[PDB]
Amino acid sequence: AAYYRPVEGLPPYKLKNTVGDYFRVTGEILSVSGGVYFFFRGIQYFLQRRPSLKSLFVDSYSEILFFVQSLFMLVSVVLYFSQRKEYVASMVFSLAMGWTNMLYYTRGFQQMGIYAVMIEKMILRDLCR
Amino acid sequence: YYKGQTALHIAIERRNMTLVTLLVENGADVQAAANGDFFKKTKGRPGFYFGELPLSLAACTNQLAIVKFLLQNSWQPADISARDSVGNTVLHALVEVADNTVDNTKFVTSMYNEILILGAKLHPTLKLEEITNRKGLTPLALAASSGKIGVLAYILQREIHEPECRHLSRKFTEWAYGPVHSSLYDLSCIDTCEKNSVLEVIAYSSSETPNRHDMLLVEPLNRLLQDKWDRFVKRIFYFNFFVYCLYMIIFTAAAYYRPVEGLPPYKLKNTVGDYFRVTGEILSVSGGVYFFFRGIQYFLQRRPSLKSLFVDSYSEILFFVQSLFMLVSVVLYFSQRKEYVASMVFSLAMGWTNMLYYTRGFQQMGIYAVMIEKMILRDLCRFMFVYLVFLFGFSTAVVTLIEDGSYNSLYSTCLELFKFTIGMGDLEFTENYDFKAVFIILLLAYVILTYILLLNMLIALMGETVNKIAQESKNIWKLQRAITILDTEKSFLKCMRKAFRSGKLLQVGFTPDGKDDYRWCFRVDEVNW
Amino acid sequence: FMFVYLVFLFGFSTAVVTLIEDGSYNSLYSTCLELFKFTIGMGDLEFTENYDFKAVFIILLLAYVILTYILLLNMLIALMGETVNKIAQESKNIWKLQRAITILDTE
Numbered sequence: 212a213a214y215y216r217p218v219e220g221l222p223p224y225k226l227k228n229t230v231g232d233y234f235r236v237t238g239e240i241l242s243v244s245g246g247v248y249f250f251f252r253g254i255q256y257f258l259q260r261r262p263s264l265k266s267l268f269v270d271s272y273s274e275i276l277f278f279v280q281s282l283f284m285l286v287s288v289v290l291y292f293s294q295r296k297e298y299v300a301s302m303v304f305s306l307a308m309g310w311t312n313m314l315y316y317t318r319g320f321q322q323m324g325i326y327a328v329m330i331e332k333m334i335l336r337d338l339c340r
Numbered sequence: 341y342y343k344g345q346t347a348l349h350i351a352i353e354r355r356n357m358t359l360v361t362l363l364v365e366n367g368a369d370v371q372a373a374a375n376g377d378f379f380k381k382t383k384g385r386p387g388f389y390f391g392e393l394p395l396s397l398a399a400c401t402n403q404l405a406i407v408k409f410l411l412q413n414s415w416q417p418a419d420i421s422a423r424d425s426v427g428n429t430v431l432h433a434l435v436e437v438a439d440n441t442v443d444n445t446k447f448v449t450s451m452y453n454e455i456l457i458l459g460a461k462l463h464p465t466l467k468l469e470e471i472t473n474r475k476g477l478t479p480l481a482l483a484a485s486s487g488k489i490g491v492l493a494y495i496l497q498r499e500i501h502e503p504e505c506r507h508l509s510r511k512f513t514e515w516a517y518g519p520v521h522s523s524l525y526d527l528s529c530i531d532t533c534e535k536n537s538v539l540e541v542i543a544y545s546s547s548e549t550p551n552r553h554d555m556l557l558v559e560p561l562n563r564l565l566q567d568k569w570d571r572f573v574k575r576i577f578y579f580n581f582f583v584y585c586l587y588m589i590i591f592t593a594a595a596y597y598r599p600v601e602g603l604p605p606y607k608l609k610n611t612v613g614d615y616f617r618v619t620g621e622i623l624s625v626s627g628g629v630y631f632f633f634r635g636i637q638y639f640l641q642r643r644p645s646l647k648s649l650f651v652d653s654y655s656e657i658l659f660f661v662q663s664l665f666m667l668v669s670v671v672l673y674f675s676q677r678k679e680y681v682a683s684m685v686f687s688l689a690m691g692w693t694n695m696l697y698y699t700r701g702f703q704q705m706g707i708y709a710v711m712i713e714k715m716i717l718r719d720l721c722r723f724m725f726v727y728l729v730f731l732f733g734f735s736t737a738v739v740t741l742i743e744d745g746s747y748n749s750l751y752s753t754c755l756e757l758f759k760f761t762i763g764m765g766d767l768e769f770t771e772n773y774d775f776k777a778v779f780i781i782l783l784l785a786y787v788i789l790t791y792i793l794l795l796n797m798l799i800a801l802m803g804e805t806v807n808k809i810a811q812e813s814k815n816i817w818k819l820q821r822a823i824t825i826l827d828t829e830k831s832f833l834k835c836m837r838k839a840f841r842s843g844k845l846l847q848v849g850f851t852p853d854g855k856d857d858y859r860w861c862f863r864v865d866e867v868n869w
Numbered sequence: 870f871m872f873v874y875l876v877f878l879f880g881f882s883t884a885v886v887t888l889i890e891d892g893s894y895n896s897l898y899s900t901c902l903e904l905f906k907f908t909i910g911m912g913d914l915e916f917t918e919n920y921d922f923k924a925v926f927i928i929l930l931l932a933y934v935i936l937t938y939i940l941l942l943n944m945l946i947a948l949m950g951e952t953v954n955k956i957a958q959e960s961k962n963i964w965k966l967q968r969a970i971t972i973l974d975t976e
């Protein structure tokens with residue numbers, strides 16, 4: 212849906228009598244639905260735990276990252292309807308994080324999960340130094 | 341169900357010697373058909389994998405009194421050679437129960453020696469140790485195939501220094517000169533047992549045997565493999581390496597000087613170069629066919645499963661795949677196509693790469709190549725997923741961020757972001773495009789995540805893996821040399837028997853019958869005090 | 870090392886040079902050079918244009934880069950690390966011997 216976005220100015224953009232626009236808008240709707248789902252999952256996670264700052268940013272990274280992805284997607288929706296071009300700038304960030312968040316699923320696979328958690332720990336303990 | 345669980349079985353099982361003695365004296369039979377589904381193998385489910393014979397229970401429970409008591413029954417004598425549903429005897433039972441631990445090895449070794457010597461004394465005419473089960477395995481071959489390294493280590497070098505018992509020994513010390521001792525090993529059924537020798541079963545296992553790497557380190561087998569290496573296999577292997585190198589050179593020369601016209605085939609002329617070229621092509625295709633049939637012969641003589649095919653025998657697969665590519669090239673060459681070049685070059689690249697197969701037989705090079713193979717298989721399946729996730733995510737992000745009425749394609753952007761791995765990234769490969777700050781942020785985030793963090797983590801993890809495979813590489817190289825030796829002697833291309841060790845040497849000169857014995861003893865010199 | 874590396878370099882050099890030909894990078898020396906450059910961080914990935922079987926050419930180069938640049942050159946570092954960790958004392962012994970030889974010759 213993102214890669215085939217239109218290249219005109221000042222969204223939103225209307226559907227035509229072709230078939231491509233229907234596939235594109237279908238993809239956009241499914242994408243935004245996914246973003247909303249992850250938004251509410253993040254809220255449900257927070258409410259059922261209520262961790263503090265000293266526990267929130269040292270644990271539960273994956274939930275934070277998925278929530279952040281959904282935030283970017285929603286900001287993109289707001290800008291898309293708000294007659295702005297910058298909806299692109301938010302959307303791509305979400306897209307990038309979305310693909311990166313694929314690594315969350317390496318858990319459940321022994322070797323891949325050990326590899327991915329080692330990478331996460333060598334990111335947190337490293338860049339700050 | 342617990343079919344055949346007679347009172348004697350329970351008395352032995354509960355370690356109640358009083359009940360066992362009373363039941364045996366009362367006339368309880370030994371040949372119990374303890375064939376209940378509980379008493380069968382497949383111990384993963386609830387069951388008892390070494391039943392179907394009370395002698396098997398008596399020996400497997402480490403109680404010498406019961407087995408010594410059943411030698412001379414009051415009513416019905418026991419028979420050590422009694423066989424269960426799958427042909428296993430007491431000795432096979434003693435092999436199967438082992439778990440390769442020091443204490444268990446001590447108990448199983450003790451019971452094995454005692455039961456074997458008692459059976460020999462009771463029936464000197466019967467060679468209990470040579471009896472095979474339904475699969476055609478002796479207890480030695482069973483221990484080797486199944487993975488019972490401890491029992492194998494015992495059996496291959498057991499000895500008894502007593503009159504009328506030394507003839508059962510494997511190891512001897514016939515001569516000594518002060519500190520020097522000239523040990524002998526009979527080593528029957530190691531070089532050949534006419535169906536399945538110890539080396540054959542260890543080397544050609546299904547890869548599930550836990551100790552196939554460690555079994556070849558034992559005292560007699562390592563020396564045998566070294567002797568066969570030094571004797572004749574070294575020369576044949578180096579000769580094969582030389583011939584293969586010449587084959588690859590001819591193939592490369594044929595490929596490089598291919599014609600540059602369209603729509604093959606192309607006819608010979610009255611010049612001289614065309615004859616050399618077509619000669620090289622014919623030799624190349626002949627080599628491809630040879631490797632094709634070698635691959636098939638390897639498959640048919642093994643029939644491994646998918647879970648064993650793609651975790652073992654990589655070299656045979658690679659040589660076969662080379663053959664497939666060359667044959668596809670031949671088909672396209674005659675089919676009036678240009679695409680034969682593609683398959684030919686893939687074959688050529690794989691042939692030169694497969695040149696590394698021959699580093700076995702050279703100590704340091706072979707260890708090096710084994711480490712490379714293991715650190716390819718273990719590392720790419722872990723690394724490339726992570727790397728491709730990052731590359732694809734940022735490629736799609738950048739390519740969908742930039743667009744005009746040149747880098748509008750995901751392929752080109754994937755390439756330009758790949759270049760950052762090989763030290764040729766630009767950091768500026770577009771201009772006047774919208775959202776310049778976002779573009780720069782994305783590229784810098786990609787560079788930090790991939791170039792600065794991920795590749796260095798790859799190096800560090802490869803360091804750890806290297807530290808943890810110093811020994812597995814040595815064992816695997818020894819195993820590869822073992823495979824080479826066994827294959828070379830098995831084929832040998834002349835139908836000659838050169839695998840013999842020392843001839844029919846008069847090791848013992850004694851049997852229970854009034855006869856001598858020749859046992860193909862192999863000599864080993866050692867020095868100690 | 871150089872045996873393994875030269876096997877890879879020569880195999881892929883011959884593959885690429887026999888894949889491309891016309892009536893500039895069509896010689897074995899130049900192609901061996903251009904594939905050597907990938908070790909020192911100056912590979913192009915696109916050093917020929919309009920040549921037949923573009924997909925095969927790209928597959929070959931990418932396979933070469935992965936096999937050599939990303940796996941082999943890093944493995945060299947890892948193995949050197951192991952050997953360096955394991956020759957720390959042998960180095961001291963050999964240096965003492967070298968000084969002993971120097972002393973004996975001078976005396």
Ligand SMILES: CCCCCCCCCCCCC(=O)O[C@@H](COC(=O)CCC)COP(=O)(O)O[C@H]1[C@H](O)[C@@H](O)[C@@H](O)[C@@H](O)[C@@H]1O
Nearest residue numbers: 270271272273274276304307308311312314315331334785
């Ligand atoms: C603009 C473009 C930006 C792209 C940014 C990309 C960031 C890197 C992406 C990293 C991908 C992996 C991932 O996203 O998942 C990782 C989190 O990696 C990070 O730390 C990112 C730091 C930043 C695991 O997440 P998790 O929530 O499982 O953490 C575990 C807890 O669950 C558990 O209770 C335990 O406490 C355990 O010790 C915890 O680890």
Ligand SMILES: CCCCCCCCCCCCC(=O)O[C@@H](COC(=O)CCC)COP(=O)(O)O[C@H]1[C@H](O)[C@@H](O)[C@@H](O)[C@@H](O)[C@@H]1O
Nearest residue numbers: 652653654655656658686689690693694696697713816932
């Ligand atoms: C288009 C261009 C593509 C070029 C592709 C090139 C691939 C890399 C080339 C690798 C060169 C080395 C080689 O080809 O030989 C290696 C195999 O390397 C690989 O794994 C390649 C993975 C892929 C050893 O082969 P081998 O059959 O001896 O395996 C041993 C068994 O014999 C033994 O029983 C034991 O199980 C032991 O643990 C096993 O190791």
